[PDB]
Amino acid sequence: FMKLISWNVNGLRACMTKGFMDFFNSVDADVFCIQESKMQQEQNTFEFKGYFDFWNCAIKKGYSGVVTFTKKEPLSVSYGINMEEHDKEGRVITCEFESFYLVNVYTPNSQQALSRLSYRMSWEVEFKKFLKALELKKPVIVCGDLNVAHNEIDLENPKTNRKNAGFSDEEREKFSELLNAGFIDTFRYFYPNKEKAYTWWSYMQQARDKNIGWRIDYFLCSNPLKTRLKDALIYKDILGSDHCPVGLELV
Ligand SMILES: [Mn+2]
Ligand SMILES: [Mn+2]
Numbered sequence: 001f002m003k004l005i006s007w008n009v010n011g012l013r014a015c016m017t018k019g020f021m022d023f024f025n026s027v028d029a030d031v032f033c034i035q036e037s038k039m040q041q042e043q044n045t046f047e048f049k050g051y052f053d054f055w056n057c058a059i060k061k062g063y064s065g066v067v068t069f070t071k072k073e074p075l076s077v078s079y080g081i082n083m084e085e086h087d088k089e090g091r092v093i094t095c096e097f098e099s100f101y102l103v104n105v106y107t108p109n110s111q112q113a114l115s116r117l118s119y120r121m122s123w124e125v126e127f128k129k130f131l132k133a134l135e136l137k138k139p140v141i142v143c144g145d146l147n148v149a150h151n152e153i154d155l156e157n158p159k160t161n162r163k164n165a166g167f168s169d170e171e172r173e174k175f176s177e178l179l180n181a182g183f184i185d186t187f188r189y190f191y192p193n194k195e196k197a198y199t200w201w202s203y204m205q206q207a208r209d210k211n212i213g214w215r216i217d218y219f220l221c222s223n224p225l226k227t228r229l230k231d232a233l234i235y236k237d238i239l240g241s242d243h244c245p246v247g248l249e250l251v
Contacts, residue, residue: 001230001251005029006143008106008200008217008243011038012067016046018240024048027235029247030071031095035106035145037065056080058090065090066144068104072097081130086123094134100225101134105144110165117170120147124174128181135182139222142183145200145243146218148175150185153195155214166216178220186219186232186248197234200243211236219248 005027009015012034024032032051039062041055051069056079058064068077074095080087093104105127110117134140148171152158161167179185191197198213207213219232233247 002030004248006033007245008035008145010241032069033104056090103142107147142220156212183220217246
């Protein structure tokens with residue numbers, strides 16, 4: 001089978017000092033995607049032996065940025081969603097493999113008090129169209145930090161967070177609409193009833209020790225890939241970021 005991993009590392013240089021490479025080497029992923037590199041490829045000093053590495057860096061320094069590491073050479077790689085307005089923040093890398101596209105994405109956060117919600121809505125409209133356009137050729141696997149918790153089971157204090165970024169009605173609706181367009185939330189495909197499964201914890205005192213968190217990191221796949229799925233993973237014990245890694249296994 002193949003093992004795919006995704007991790008918002010909250011700054012790759014920071015995460016490296018907190019053991020990133022130890023988990024990278026240990027999990028031995030066929031494809032390992034990261035979000036929030038917060039660095040430029042030119043300044044990379046780290047070695048990912050045995051992997052191709054593809055970087056997408058923001059114009060703004062020390063901001064956002066994603067990287068895809070893959071053992072297998074892709075058939076093609078693209079960056080962004082082919083819209084200049086949305087392609088300035090180092091957020092999307094798409095690697096084409098033989099039987100699917102793998103889209104690595106760091107979704108724009110709506111920010112405190114939902115100040116960037118209007119832009120986020122425009123992002124969601126275009127991102128969905130981008131994914132459907134890919135599906136004209138091949139099914140799609142999406143992974144990354146999507147900055148949305150879907151249902152009440154997906155975060156610790158639902159009723160007090162509906163005006164916070166990631167759990168607004170507006171964001172939840174776009175994620176529902178994304179799935180209604182033909183995508184599977186793989187973790188909930190295998191574990192629909194699992195409570196307290198989170199991938200992000202705030203800096204509230206001991207939040208992570210108490211597992212007061214949200215699930216906002218995902219693997220999604222086109223409906224026809226359903227029969228190839230083997231498992232969906234949350235690496236809750238891996239430290240080094242305010243997010244933990246997520247994973248997908250398939251044949
Ligand atoms: Mn961060
Ligand atoms: Mn060749």
